[PDB]
Design a protein around this nucleic acid. Structure first.
Lengths: 101, 103, 117, 140, 34, 56, 139
RNA sequence: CCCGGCGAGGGGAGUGAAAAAGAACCUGAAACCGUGUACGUACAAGCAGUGGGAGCACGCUUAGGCGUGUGACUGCGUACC
RNA sequence: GUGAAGAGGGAAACAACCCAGACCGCCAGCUAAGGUCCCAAAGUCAUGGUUAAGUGGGAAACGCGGAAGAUGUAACGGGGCUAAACCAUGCACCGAAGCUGCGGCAGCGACGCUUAUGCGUUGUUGGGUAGGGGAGCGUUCUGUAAGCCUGCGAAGGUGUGCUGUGAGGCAUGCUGGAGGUAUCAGAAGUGCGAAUGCUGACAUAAGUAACGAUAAAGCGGGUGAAAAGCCC
RNA sequence: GAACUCGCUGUGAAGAUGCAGUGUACCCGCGGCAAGACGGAAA
């Protein structure tokens, strides 16, 4: 049993978001929130928001057991891009799956 | 307790109860064949050979299945010469269950 | 009546890429270089199959020379004795008997020495 | 049946000790290279180290053949914008260096060659500390 | 027999379509050389 | 001063192998508020070293 | 093809998007001249083949008093025929009036006999006058 | 209904046969960017493949030395038009 | 004679130097040139001799001298060989796709049955540019087809296995939810890897220049979740 | 075009990162020289 949260069309680069995500994958949620909230990357706020939404959905629709939450899968993938004249803006999708076990 | 014999022109060292691959032969599946051609017999004391075609060795071979070998693709190509051909190929093979060694 | 080439090109690319697996990135993903990779691999396989007989012949020669030296006889003299004694055992059989059972090879070389002169 | 292949963990390798004093350097070098290669053993395959460990002692009294004591010289370049070493000087300092150079020349070049060369143990003095492995002293 | 009639052998020939690969014989230069 | 070849994925991965960030792993719990906070910082509630601060 | 010949070669090129096809077909009739002797010989050969194959049935006269499709269906069922081609001489209003409704059953005159219909249809129903008319036509 | 910022977006429930049809809306390979899985690599040099090949996990014959995933190591090997 | 239009083996790497004209496959053998100290497979083989200088392992005329080889040994391929160099002879071995041993595929002459032929075979061919000739596979539509399969699952995409000397074909899990189509004949807008070919998407150098007159910015409060570029 | 992109000797469409021999080198980034760079240009 796991809860999936995917934020689409993120307004940030697909690399820096990946750099932020690399530091949180495989870490306990309790300390993951604290460590992520105290970083120097603007992309960190999007990750915090999506993780907060994921945990809120998990606790509302399923047993909270907030202490025993562990992140299993998390990844960022490049999203839609539009061509214009000054260039393409880079968008990303952020996906996080959290399971108690 | 093994033996050495050639049937399709290829030397084979086969022990009792060991399945070996031989070239295709016009041998029916329902009948056994005799390979009177022997070259060496392995036992507690090996039987030396002074001349080939030793009559003291009798080998019974029973074909159990038929088929072709693994498909192999041969490609002949030349650089800058616009010459290139490709063709698949396979070879028939037979398996014989060897029982009993004559000393 | 216009016809669409999508199906034929799709099938050709699929079949050619299927044989091209594990060629260090681009060669296994890009058709342009994948064609060269597969054709060169086929030619290399053909030539290596041709040379495999020679390679295994060299391996058997080395093993037989090692066995003869261990038994205390030169490889050339051993071959001369074996052939002049009316023995048609293939080098593969000699290597197999030498590696597996040492007593049999020792007896064979002793017999060759007996029928050497 | 497929050709027999020696398994690296199944190889049984012993210890051999050879003295180069009063011996032709070329012949003994070739013999050591052959023994390291494992080609002497019947169960030899040119893909794994089937040879035996070799120990060389008393390399100071190696017998020079002909007038190569001074005529023969080796040049090595450090790779800069050259180093000169005379045969007599290197012989007086450490004959093990020239012995190792010759052995490396004998062995095939490559990582496998380096791995096989790792088995050589050359000592300037007659005495050695490897006697704990009950090495078999063979004179050749 | 509803529709099975076919032309006799040799009466109909598929012809030659040059400039189609190398397996079809002539495929380059259009047959006029360089 | 211009490119002549096409670097593959390996070069991009290796060059990007050193930009990975690291966790501070230095959070401290305030004695009074009992809430995690960074070392040598000021808590949101307005506490530091156990004494009172402006806490605006 | 409408466009512009100004150099950007030219936009109206076969190798560019929305470009004209260099080998563009043109409207030309595909009809091929067929000799009268060839047509007569083909008709004779097919007619001779049909009789030897027992695929041709000859009747004195096939007609219906009134243009009733149901009656024609019953008559065909009596003869155990479902896909047959009727060939006759003078056109009859009662029979011709009902011919298009049945796709497997159609009536034709000897003057405009079509070989493709004869070949495709399993069986052909002749007439006492129709056979004489067609044999005179071929001669 | 909840998180989110009364944004966007997401989750649950429900409609809908399908939401794996959600308005960036039929079917969705490749070039391109990843996750998890099995393997190899931090002392080894060159069209990066091939032949042999111990090892490392799995289905198997419910061992019988079979195949699948990678290939430590070496002989050979200077792209296409 | 070779390349042109022939691969292979040896000479370090080679198209004109030597041997040798590749139908395919088999963990078989015998040879040509070339080698038998290791690298690297075979004689550290046997007999009659030269070498003291590494000449061998580069050097004409002239009697060991005449005679210098270079980015780093660099004119034995490296070692070292006083014979592991060289002159002569003997028996051997290694040695290619050359020959033979086994299996298989296609064509071409010669025959006895035989016919719109398969056998018994008898010999041979199967490297190939330009070029010529012959034989075939894939797709649209048309008649076949108001036949057949198909919401119990068609195409299209995708994974597996089998099959054919080949282009290909066959069955099957999966998103997929509506068409496809046997055999036989007829036409191509018919098979893509390149022409600085065109259209849509994307890696690339890379999170690298730089963020554009060097007039210059701040403090408290307010709105805003988030304020140093918003307001006071 | 793709590179698991080292230095010398010889060969080489004639000064070779990719051919033969030899030697060096744990993997990967950061600021400078530009000696290479057949990319422009400099008789």
């Amino acid at each position: 049993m796991e809860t999936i949260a995917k934020h689409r069309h993120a307004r940030s680069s697909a690399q820096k978001v990946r750099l932020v995500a690399d530091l949180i994958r495989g870490k306990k949620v309790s300390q993951a929130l604290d460590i992520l909230t105290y970083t120097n990357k603007k992309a960190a706020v999007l990750v915090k928001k999506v993780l907060e939404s994921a945990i809120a959905n998990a606790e509302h629709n399923d047993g909270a057991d907030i202490d025993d939450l562990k992140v299993t899968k998390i990844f960022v993938d490049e999203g839609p891009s539009m061509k214009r004249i000054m260039i393409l803006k880079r968008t990303s999708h952020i996906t996080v799956v959290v399971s108690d076990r | 307790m093994y033996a050495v014999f050639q049937s399709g022109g290829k030397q084979h060292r086969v022990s009792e109860g060991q399945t070996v691959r031989l070239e295709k032969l016009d041998i029916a599946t329902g009948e056994t064949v005799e390979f009177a051609e022997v070259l060496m017999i392995a036992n507690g004391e090996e039987v030396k050979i002074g001349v080939p075609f030793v009559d003291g060795g009798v080998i019974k071979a029973e074909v159990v299945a038929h088929g072709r070998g693994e498909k192999v693709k041969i490609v002949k190509f030349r650089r800058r010469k616009h010459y290139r051909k490709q063709q698949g190929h396979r070879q028939w093979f037979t398996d014989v269950k060897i029982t009993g060694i004559s000393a | 009546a216009r016809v669409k080439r999508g199906v034929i090109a799709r099938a050709r690319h699929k079949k050619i890429l299927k044989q091209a697996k594990g060629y260090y990135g681009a060669r296994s993903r890009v058709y342009r270089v994948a064609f060269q990779a597969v054709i060169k691999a086929g030619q290399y396989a053909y030539r290596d199959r041709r040379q495999r007989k020679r390679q295994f012949r060299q391996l058997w020669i080395a093993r037989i020379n090692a066995a003869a030296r261990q038994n205390g006889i030169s490889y050339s003299k051993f071959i001369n004795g074996l052939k002049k004694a009316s023995v048609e055992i293939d080098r593969k059989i000699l290597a197999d008997i030498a590696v597996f059972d040492k007593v049999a090879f020792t007896a064979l070389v002793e017999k060759a020495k007996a029928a050497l002169a | 049946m497929k050709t027999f292949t020696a398994k690296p963990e199944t190889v049984k390798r012993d210890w051999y000790v050879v003295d180069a004093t009063g011996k032709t350097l070329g012949r003994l070098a070739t013999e050591l290279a052959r023994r390291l290669r494992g080609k002497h053993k019947a169960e030899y395959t040119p893909h794994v180290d089937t040879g035996d460990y070799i120990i060389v002692l008393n390399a100071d009294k190696v017998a020079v053949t002909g007038n190569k004591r001074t005529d023969k010289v080796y040049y090595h370049h450090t790779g800069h914008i050259i180093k000169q070493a005379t045969f007599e000087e290197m012989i007086a300092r450490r004959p093990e260096r020239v012995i190792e150079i010759a052995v490396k020349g004998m062995l095939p070049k490559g990582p496998l060659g380096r791995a096989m060369f790792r088995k050589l143990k050359v000592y300037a003095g007659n005495e050695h500390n490897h006697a704990a492995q009950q090495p078999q002293v063979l004179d050749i | 027999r509803l529709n099975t009639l076919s032309p006799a052998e040799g009466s109909k020939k598929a012809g030659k379509r040059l400039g189609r690969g190398i397996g079809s014989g002539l495929g380059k230069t259009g047959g006029r050389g360089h | 001063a211009v490119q002549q070849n096409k670097p593959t994925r390996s070069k991009r991965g290796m060059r990007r192998s050193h930009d990975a960030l690291t966790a501070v792993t230095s959070l401290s719990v305030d004695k009074t508020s009992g809430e995690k906070h960074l070392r040598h910082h000021i808590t949101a509630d307005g506490y530091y070293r156990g004494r009172k601060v402006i806490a605006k | 093809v409408t466009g512009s010949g100004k150099k950007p070669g030219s936009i109206k090129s076969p190798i560019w998007r929305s470009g004209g096809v260099t080998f563009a077909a043109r409207p030309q009739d595909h009809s091929q001249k067929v000799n009268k002797k060839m047509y007569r010989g083909a008709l004779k050969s097919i007619l001779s083949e049909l009789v030897r194959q027992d695929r041709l049935i000859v009747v004195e006269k096939f007609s219906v008093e009134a243009p009733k499709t149901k009656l024609l269906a019953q008559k065909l069922k009596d003869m155990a025929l479902e896909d047959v081609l009727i060939i006759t001489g003078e056109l009859d209003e009662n029979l011709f009036l009902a011919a298009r409704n049945l796709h497997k059953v159609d009536v034709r005159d000897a003057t405009g006999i079509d070989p493709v219909s004869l070949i495709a249809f399993d069986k052909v129903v002749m007439t006492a006058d129709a056979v004489k008319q067609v044999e005179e036509m071929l001669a």
